[PDB]
RNA sequence: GGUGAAAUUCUUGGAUUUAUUGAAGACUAACUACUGCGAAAGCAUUUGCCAAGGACGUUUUCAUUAAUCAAGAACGAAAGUUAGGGGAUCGAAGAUGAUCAGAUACCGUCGUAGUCUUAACCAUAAACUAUGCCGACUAGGGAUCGGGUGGUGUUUUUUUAAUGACCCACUCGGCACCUUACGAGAAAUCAAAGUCUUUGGGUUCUGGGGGGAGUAUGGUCGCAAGGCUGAAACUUAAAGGAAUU
C-alpha cells in the first residue's frame, strides 16, 4: 500500500486511540 | 442534432428584410474619401424609429479603406455614429488599433516589449487613454542576439515617451489629433527622443479609448461632414 | 511579575463564560481601555467616556468614533473615499 | 455598390457558426449554424456541415442582395482550446467560391490575460 | 537512478516557477516544464490561397497568418507525437 | 438606549435673534469645535448635510430620509451607511443601496449627512452576563427575558402543551393568518441555515 | 444529380486502417486548372475518369 | 451545451449569437530564455515613498574584530483553524447523468468549505541541487548577467563634444553549458562526487540488515488537526543500489 494512505490510516488510528484514552481517563 | 428538440415553447412570419431598409454612413472629414458602406435598420416606427436606433451604433472600418492606400492596412478604426439626417448617418472617431496578426507577428522572442500609457484629456473635454509600444533593436555588426535592455533604460524610455505623448495630447482637438495619427508622425520624434537611451525599433501607437464624452456638439460635428 | 500567563485582563471573570468568549472580550477590552492621543495636541491622554465617545483630560476635545476604538478601519476607509470624491469633484 | 457586411465566423471543436451581420454588427443575415445540416450529434463540427452552412448563408445573402463580405474568424476563445476549429476553414472555402466576394481576412478570437482558472483541476484530464 | 542531468527542465538556482495550464488536458505544469511549440500557421489552408485570391474583393492584399504558442505537457506531447522518445545517446543533442 | 452618540449642533436663526439647537447623531470622526455646513451649496465634508442630488456618484451618506422634510429617516443606527449608486435627472431620483442590501429610488431633495455614524462595531463583545443584557434592555423596553412557547402552557401559547417540549404543528406561519396564530416563523420563503454566500 | 467527370493525374497513396481506400489528386476536364483531393475505393490508375457527385467536398486522410 | 460515443441541463416569454454600457472578483499571458534577485520559502503591469542587499572601483578607516555550531531565536510553499470583508472563475464533501457484473472513481452538469484580502495560530513537503559551511590547488572551450580598464574601433547625435547602443582584448564576482578523465566512484556519473589504503585543512548533524515504527509511552508547544524528542517486545534471511541478456 502507498505510504501516504498508510500514514493517513495511522493518523486515524492515533485519533481513535487518543479518544479511547481520553474517555478512559 | 437536427432531430433533438423535445419541446420548444414553454407556454405550450414574413421576411424581416421587407421592413428593413438601407442607410449609408458618412465618416468624419479628418479622413479621406469616406465610402463607408451601408447598414440595415428597422422601419422608422412611431415608438422606436430608425434615427434613435442608429444613435447607438458603431461601425468597424480599416484605415486603409478610408485612406485608399496600402501602408495603413494594419490599422483599423471604429466609427461612432451620433446623428443622422437621412441615408447619410454621420459618425465620429472612436478608437484605433492594429490587427491580431499584426500584434502577434510584432511580438517576437529575444526582444523587449516596452509599453506606456497615460490618462490624459484633449482641449474639448475629450478624455483618451493613449497607449504606446516599443521594441529594442539589434544594431549592425552585433553578435549579441538578444538586444536586452536594463530596467533603468526601460524606465527612462517610458518616462520620455509619456512626456512627449502628453505634450502632443495637450492643446489639440480630435480633428488635428487624427490628422497627425494618419501620417504616422508620432513615432518620428518618439524615436528621436528615445534613441539615445536605446536604438529602439518597431515604434507604433497601440490604441486609444473613448472614456468621457462632452455634449452633442452639432455645430462642430457638422464640420466633419460639411 | 507576570501574575497571569494568557488570560490577562479577563482574570476577573475566573472560571466562567467559556474560553473563546473570554478571549474575545479580553481583546476588545484591551482595545477599549488602551490610551490614545488627541489629534489636536499629540499627547496620549485620550480615554473612553461612553459608547463611541472618546474624551480627554488635557486636549479637552471629545471625538465620536467606534465603540471600543477611537478610529475604525471602515470609518477611515470611508473618510479617505469621501476625501477622494471631494478632490475629484473640485479638480 | 459592393455593399460590405461582416461574416463573424465562429469555429469550435463541437459546433460551427456562420452569422453574417452588417458592418456595424447589429444584423441577422443568415445566422444559420452548422448543426441542422447533419443528423449525427457528433459530426456538427465537420467540413461537410460547415460547407453546407456556408452555402446556405451565401444563398441567403444573395437573396438579401449583399455581394461583398468581410470575414472575421474566431476560435473557441478564452480559457479553452484557443485553436481554430476544422470547420472554420471549410466554411470560409465554401463561402469563397459560392457567390459573395470576401475581403480583409482577420482573426478576432478573444484571448484573456491570465484571468480566472482553467477547468480540469491541477492534475488535468485523465481520460 | 539519475536518468537526466537536468531533473525536470532548465531550472537551476531558481526554485519555484509560476505554473501554466496545458492547452488540451488543462494540467498545471511549471512554465519551463511545458513543451512550448511556436506554431505559426495560416488562417487559409493549403491549396486554398489560389481559390481565395480571385474570389476576394480588392486585388492581392489579405495574405495574413495566425500565430499561437501551445504549452503541451509531457503526456500530451507523447500522445500527440509532438516529441518522440529516442535512444540514450541521442538525448544529449541540442 | 442608543449606541450611537448624540451630537448637539446650535444654529443661528436667520429670521430672529435666537439660537436654535438641533439634535444630530454623532458621525464617526466629528469633534467639538468643528463647523457643520448644511445646505446645497455646502462642500463635501464629513458631517455636512447635503441634498442627495448634489453629492457625486459613489458617495457614502447617513441619516437620509425617504421624502424631503422627513428630518432624516433611514440609516440612523450605529455603524450603518447608504451608498449612492446612481442619479437620474428627469424626475430627479437618486438610486441608493441601503444597509440591508435593498435598492430603493428616492427623491433628490432628500438630504443626508456625509460619513458614517460613530459607534460602529458595537455588537462584537458578547454580553457575557445576564446583568449587562438586563441593563441594556431596561433602558430600551420591557422585552427581556422572553419565555419559550414550548415551555409555555398550551392555552398560553399554541406551541405549548404535551409531555415533551415540541411544536406539534408547523412553525412557519402564513401571512394570511389572523392575530393569535402568528407564533413562530412568518412567511418563511426559505427555512433553515443557508449554505454559501448570502449574495445580497 | 449534378455529375462531374474528373480524370486523375497522381495517386497519393493507400489510406485507412484496412487499406481499402486510396488517396488521389484529381481534376476535371470541364473548366480545368483547379484540382481537388478525392478518395477512391476501387483500384485507380493514372488517366482514370470518375463521376463525382460532389464538388466542394475536399476530403481528408482516412483512419 | 458537451464526450470516444452519449447523457443531465438551457431553449418562439428569444436558447446559443451579434453590438454598446455598467458592477464584481482573480491574475500580470504573449515579451518569458538552460536569463535576474533573495538565507530559504519565494518574486514578472505603471508610478510615487520608505528603506534594504549583492557585485565593482578605492594609495580611506579599525585592527584580528575570524570558520562551524549543543542550548535558544527569526523567517518559512500549499493546505487547515479563529474572528471580519469579499466571495468573479476553479472547486475536496455532496447532488445527478453516463461506463461497467459491480464504480461510492476516471467522463458530463451543478455545487458548500476553500481559492482573494485584514488581525492571530498551524512550523509541515520529492522544503531536491535527494549533493553542509568556510578556505588552498588541479585539463581545456564557447556563450551569458552585473561591474571595471584600454581601443589612431563602429554608430547615434549638433556629419564631428558629452551621454548612450554596439564590436575587439583583459579582469572580478554569479547562473550555468560542451569534449574529455590527470583522478574519484560498485556503476549511473562527477572539474567536483578530485587532491581518501601515497589514508590527517577546521568544523556541525545524521545511519549500523529489512519489518515492528516514525509506533507506544514519558515530556514539550498548539484552540484544533497536529509539531519536536523518541523505544522495547516479537519476526525474517534476505530486504536493497547500479548496469548486462
Tab-separated table of N, CA, C and O in Angstrom, chain E residues 14-82:
chain	number	residue	atom	x	y	z
E	14	UNK	N	16.882	28.614	-9.387
E	14	UNK	CA	15.645	29.383	-9.390
E	14	UNK	C	14.638	28.883	-8.366
E	14	UNK	O	14.154	29.664	-7.541
E	15	UNK	N	14.309	27.595	-8.392
E	15	UNK	CA	13.381	27.041	-7.427
E	15	UNK	C	11.951	26.975	-7.923
E	15	UNK	O	11.590	26.070	-8.682
E	16	UNK	N	11.126	27.928	-7.499
E	16	UNK	CA	9.712	27.942	-7.851
E	16	UNK	C	9.490	28.772	-9.108
E	16	UNK	O	9.977	29.903	-9.209
E	17	UNK	N	8.755	28.205	-10.061
E	17	UNK	CA	8.404	28.870	-11.308
E	17	UNK	C	6.886	28.894	-11.417
E	17	UNK	O	6.220	27.898	-11.114
E	18	UNK	N	6.344	30.035	-11.832
E	18	UNK	CA	4.899	30.176	-11.949
E	18	UNK	C	4.357	29.155	-12.945
E	18	UNK	O	4.885	29.041	-14.060
E	19	UNK	N	3.320	28.403	-12.592
E	19	UNK	CA	2.853	27.326	-13.465
E	19	UNK	C	1.839	27.807	-14.492
E	19	UNK	O	1.215	28.862	-14.359
E	20	UNK	N	1.689	26.997	-15.540
E	20	UNK	CA	0.750	27.254	-16.621
E	20	UNK	C	-0.068	25.992	-16.862
E	20	UNK	O	0.323	24.883	-16.491
E	21	UNK	N	-1.216	26.177	-17.506
E	21	UNK	CA	-2.137	25.087	-17.789
E	21	UNK	C	-1.945	24.595	-19.217
E	21	UNK	O	-1.723	25.390	-20.136
E	22	UNK	N	-2.025	23.279	-19.393
E	22	UNK	CA	-1.874	22.680	-20.710
E	22	UNK	C	-3.020	23.099	-21.629
E	22	UNK	O	-4.129	23.412	-21.187
E	23	UNK	N	-2.731	23.102	-22.932
E	23	UNK	CA	-3.689	23.610	-23.910
E	23	UNK	C	-4.901	22.692	-24.019
E	23	UNK	O	-6.034	23.161	-24.184
E	24	UNK	N	-4.694	21.378	-23.931
E	24	UNK	CA	-5.765	20.413	-24.148
E	24	UNK	C	-6.197	19.723	-22.860
E	24	UNK	O	-7.383	19.748	-22.515
E	25	UNK	N	-5.268	19.102	-22.135
E	25	UNK	CA	-5.633	18.375	-20.925
E	25	UNK	C	-5.800	19.280	-19.712
E	25	UNK	O	-6.265	18.804	-18.672
E	26	UNK	N	-5.447	20.562	-19.825
E	26	UNK	CA	-5.622	21.545	-18.753
E	26	UNK	C	-4.978	21.074	-17.450
E	26	UNK	O	-5.563	21.162	-16.367
E	27	UNK	N	-3.755	20.564	-17.563
E	27	UNK	CA	-2.974	20.130	-16.413
E	27	UNK	C	-1.992	21.234	-16.041
E	27	UNK	O	-1.418	21.880	-16.924
E	28	UNK	N	-1.829	21.468	-14.740
E	28	UNK	CA	-0.939	22.521	-14.264
E	28	UNK	C	0.493	22.005	-14.206
E	28	UNK	O	0.786	21.043	-13.487
E	29	UNK	N	1.384	22.640	-14.961
E	29	UNK	CA	2.788	22.239	-15.012
E	29	UNK	C	3.663	23.485	-14.922
E	29	UNK	O	3.226	24.573	-15.322
E	30	UNK	N	4.892	23.379	-14.416
E	30	UNK	CA	5.778	24.550	-14.389
E	30	UNK	C	6.000	25.107	-15.788
E	30	UNK	O	6.018	24.371	-16.779
E	31	UNK	N	6.155	26.433	-15.856
E	31	UNK	CA	6.237	27.112	-17.147
E	31	UNK	C	7.406	26.599	-17.979
E	31	UNK	O	7.261	26.361	-19.182
E	32	UNK	N	8.572	26.419	-17.358
E	32	UNK	CA	9.707	25.849	-18.074
E	32	UNK	C	9.527	24.376	-18.409
E	32	UNK	O	10.150	23.893	-19.361
E	33	UNK	N	8.710	23.650	-17.643
E	33	UNK	CA	8.470	22.238	-17.904
E	33	UNK	C	7.473	22.007	-19.027
E	33	UNK	O	7.385	20.885	-19.534
E	34	UNK	N	6.725	23.032	-19.425
E	34	UNK	CA	5.796	22.903	-20.535
E	34	UNK	C	6.561	22.891	-21.851
E	34	UNK	O	7.391	23.769	-22.104
E	35	UNK	N	6.284	21.893	-22.687
E	35	UNK	CA	6.868	21.828	-24.024
E	35	UNK	C	6.156	22.886	-24.863
E	35	UNK	O	4.989	22.729	-25.221
E	36	UNK	N	6.850	23.980	-25.156
E	36	UNK	CA	6.250	25.111	-25.848
E	36	UNK	C	6.569	25.044	-27.334
E	36	UNK	O	7.739	25.024	-27.726
E	37	UNK	N	5.523	25.006	-28.155
E	37	UNK	CA	5.660	24.951	-29.603
E	37	UNK	C	5.178	26.260	-30.209
E	37	UNK	O	4.019	26.646	-30.023
E	38	UNK	N	6.068	26.938	-30.935
E	38	UNK	CA	5.739	28.200	-31.595
E	38	UNK	C	5.107	27.882	-32.947
E	38	UNK	O	5.765	27.829	-33.990
E	39	UNK	N	3.794	27.663	-32.920
E	39	UNK	CA	3.053	27.268	-34.114
E	39	UNK	C	2.624	28.514	-34.880
E	39	UNK	O	1.755	29.271	-34.426
E	40	UNK	N	3.224	28.721	-36.048
E	40	UNK	CA	2.902	29.836	-36.928
E	40	UNK	C	2.263	29.240	-38.177
E	40	UNK	O	2.949	28.687	-39.046
E	41	UNK	N	0.943	29.342	-38.273
E	41	UNK	CA	0.182	28.752	-39.364
E	41	UNK	C	-0.515	29.847	-40.164
E	41	UNK	O	-0.352	31.042	-39.911
E	42	UNK	N	-1.312	29.423	-41.138
E	42	UNK	CA	-2.096	30.333	-41.958
E	42	UNK	C	-3.579	30.072	-41.742
E	42	UNK	O	-4.017	28.918	-41.700
E	43	UNK	N	-4.352	31.155	-41.605
E	43	UNK	CA	-5.801	31.039	-41.449
E	43	UNK	C	-6.499	30.664	-42.746
E	43	UNK	O	-7.731	30.545	-42.762
E	44	UNK	N	-5.753	30.486	-43.833
E	44	UNK	CA	-6.242	29.844	-45.046
E	44	UNK	C	-5.346	28.642	-45.320
E	44	UNK	O	-4.118	28.777	-45.367
E	45	UNK	N	-5.959	27.474	-45.488
E	45	UNK	CA	-5.210	26.229	-45.560
E	45	UNK	C	-4.523	26.084	-46.917
E	45	UNK	O	-4.644	26.932	-47.806
E	46	UNK	N	-3.785	24.988	-47.072
E	46	UNK	CA	-3.073	24.720	-48.312
E	46	UNK	C	-4.053	24.454	-49.450
E	46	UNK	O	-5.176	23.991	-49.238
E	47	UNK	N	-3.612	24.767	-50.668
E	47	UNK	CA	-4.400	24.651	-51.892
E	47	UNK	C	-5.668	25.495	-51.859
E	47	UNK	O	-6.570	25.284	-52.678
E	48	UNK	N	-5.761	26.449	-50.930
E	48	UNK	CA	-6.911	27.333	-50.834
E	48	UNK	C	-6.592	28.782	-51.159
E	48	UNK	O	-7.517	29.550	-51.436
E	49	UNK	N	-5.315	29.172	-51.136
E	49	UNK	CA	-4.946	30.555	-51.433
E	49	UNK	C	-5.286	30.899	-52.879
E	49	UNK	O	-5.751	32.007	-53.178
E	50	UNK	N	-5.065	29.956	-53.796
E	50	UNK	CA	-5.386	30.203	-55.198
E	50	UNK	C	-6.872	30.476	-55.384
E	50	UNK	O	-7.258	31.423	-56.078
E	51	UNK	N	-7.726	29.656	-54.768
E	51	UNK	CA	-9.164	29.870	-54.871
E	51	UNK	C	-9.623	31.100	-54.103
E	51	UNK	O	-10.643	31.696	-54.462
E	52	UNK	N	-8.899	31.489	-53.058
E	52	UNK	CA	-9.272	32.622	-52.226
E	52	UNK	C	-8.800	33.954	-52.795
E	52	UNK	O	-9.299	35.003	-52.373
E	53	UNK	N	-7.852	33.938	-53.731
E	53	UNK	CA	-7.322	35.172	-54.308
E	53	UNK	C	-8.313	35.836	-55.262
E	53	UNK	O	-8.735	36.974	-55.032
E	54	UNK	N	-8.689	35.140	-56.339
E	54	UNK	CA	-9.567	35.740	-57.339
E	54	UNK	C	-10.989	35.932	-56.831
E	54	UNK	O	-11.735	36.731	-57.405
E	55	UNK	N	-11.382	35.220	-55.774
E	55	UNK	CA	-12.709	35.351	-55.186
E	55	UNK	C	-12.718	36.300	-53.993
E	55	UNK	O	-13.534	36.141	-53.078
E	56	UNK	N	-11.826	37.287	-53.985
E	56	UNK	CA	-11.702	38.233	-52.888
E	56	UNK	C	-11.831	39.657	-53.410
E	56	UNK	O	-11.299	39.988	-54.474
E	57	UNK	N	-12.546	40.498	-52.657
E	57	UNK	CA	-12.643	41.909	-53.010
E	57	UNK	C	-11.263	42.542	-52.909
E	57	UNK	O	-10.443	42.160	-52.064
E	58	UNK	N	-11.001	43.513	-53.789
E	58	UNK	CA	-9.716	44.179	-53.989
E	58	UNK	C	-8.677	43.202	-54.528
E	58	UNK	O	-8.683	42.016	-54.171
E	59	UNK	N	-7.768	43.663	-55.379
E	59	UNK	CA	-6.700	42.789	-55.870
E	59	UNK	C	-5.573	42.626	-54.856
E	59	UNK	O	-5.329	43.483	-54.006
E	60	UNK	N	-4.857	41.504	-55.006
E	60	UNK	CA	-3.976	40.916	-53.995
E	60	UNK	C	-4.455	41.206	-52.575
E	60	UNK	O	-5.600	40.896	-52.227
E	61	UNK	N	-3.577	41.787	-51.753
E	61	UNK	CA	-3.842	42.116	-50.354
E	61	UNK	C	-4.055	40.861	-49.518
E	61	UNK	O	-3.624	39.769	-49.905
E	62	UNK	N	-4.716	41.019	-48.367
E	62	UNK	CA	-5.002	39.935	-47.431
E	62	UNK	C	-3.730	39.258	-46.931
E	62	UNK	O	-2.996	39.833	-46.122
E	63	UNK	N	-3.483	38.028	-47.399
E	63	UNK	CA	-2.386	37.127	-47.040
E	63	UNK	C	-1.946	37.234	-45.579
E	63	UNK	O	-0.763	37.470	-45.305
E	64	UNK	N	-2.854	37.037	-44.609
E	64	UNK	CA	-2.445	37.104	-43.202
E	64	UNK	C	-2.002	35.753	-42.662
E	64	UNK	O	-1.940	34.771	-43.407
E	65	UNK	N	-1.691	35.692	-41.368
E	65	UNK	CA	-1.267	34.451	-40.736
E	65	UNK	C	-1.752	34.432	-39.293
E	65	UNK	O	-2.068	35.472	-38.710
E	66	UNK	N	-1.814	33.230	-38.725
E	66	UNK	CA	-2.136	33.039	-37.320
E	66	UNK	C	-0.906	32.521	-36.581
E	66	UNK	O	-0.062	31.822	-37.150
E	67	UNK	N	-0.791	32.904	-35.312
E	67	UNK	CA	0.391	32.599	-34.509
E	67	UNK	C	-0.075	32.252	-33.104
E	67	UNK	O	-0.600	33.119	-32.397
E	68	UNK	N	0.116	31.000	-32.695
E	68	UNK	CA	-0.275	30.557	-31.364
E	68	UNK	C	0.849	29.750	-30.728
E	68	UNK	O	1.555	28.992	-31.402
E	69	UNK	N	1.007	29.926	-29.419
E	69	UNK	CA	2.020	29.232	-28.632
E	69	UNK	C	1.329	28.173	-27.785
E	69	UNK	O	0.554	28.503	-26.881
E	70	UNK	N	1.612	26.906	-28.076
E	70	UNK	CA	0.958	25.784	-27.416
E	70	UNK	C	1.883	25.217	-26.347
E	70	UNK	O	3.036	24.875	-26.634
E	71	UNK	N	1.375	25.123	-25.120
E	71	UNK	CA	2.116	24.553	-23.997
E	71	UNK	C	1.607	23.135	-23.774
E	71	UNK	O	0.602	22.925	-23.089
E	72	UNK	N	2.297	22.156	-24.351
E	72	UNK	CA	1.917	20.755	-24.243
E	72	UNK	C	2.671	20.115	-23.085
E	72	UNK	O	3.891	20.277	-22.969
E	73	UNK	N	1.946	19.395	-22.232
E	73	UNK	CA	2.583	18.648	-21.161
E	73	UNK	C	3.303	17.433	-21.741
E	73	UNK	O	3.214	17.138	-22.935
E	74	UNK	N	4.039	16.721	-20.887
E	74	UNK	CA	4.822	15.581	-21.356
E	74	UNK	C	3.910	14.495	-21.914
E	74	UNK	O	4.140	13.970	-23.011
E	75	UNK	N	2.851	14.153	-21.175
E	75	UNK	CA	1.954	13.085	-21.607
E	75	UNK	C	1.231	13.459	-22.896
E	75	UNK	O	1.118	12.643	-23.818
E	76	UNK	N	0.729	14.694	-22.975
E	76	UNK	CA	0.025	15.128	-24.178
E	76	UNK	C	0.960	15.178	-25.379
E	76	UNK	O	0.568	14.806	-26.491
E	77	UNK	N	2.196	15.641	-25.179
E	77	UNK	CA	3.159	15.673	-26.274
E	77	UNK	C	3.496	14.267	-26.752
E	77	UNK	O	3.607	14.024	-27.959
E	78	UNK	N	3.662	13.326	-25.819
E	78	UNK	CA	3.929	11.942	-26.206
E	78	UNK	C	2.751	11.372	-26.986
E	78	UNK	O	2.931	10.699	-28.009
E	79	UNK	N	1.527	11.637	-26.521
E	79	UNK	CA	0.346	11.108	-27.194
E	79	UNK	C	0.155	11.714	-28.580
E	79	UNK	O	-0.243	11.007	-29.513
E	80	UNK	N	0.430	13.008	-28.737
E	80	UNK	CA	0.226	13.707	-29.998
E	80	UNK	C	1.469	13.724	-30.878
E	80	UNK	O	1.460	14.381	-31.925
E	81	UNK	N	2.538	13.037	-30.467
E	81	UNK	CA	3.763	12.907	-31.259
E	81	UNK	C	4.455	14.252	-31.465
E	81	UNK	O	5.179	14.444	-32.447
E	82	UNK	N	4.234	15.196	-30.549
E	82	UNK	CA	4.959	16.462	-30.599
E	82	UNK	C	6.447	16.226	-30.376
E	82	UNK	O	7.296	16.768	-31.092
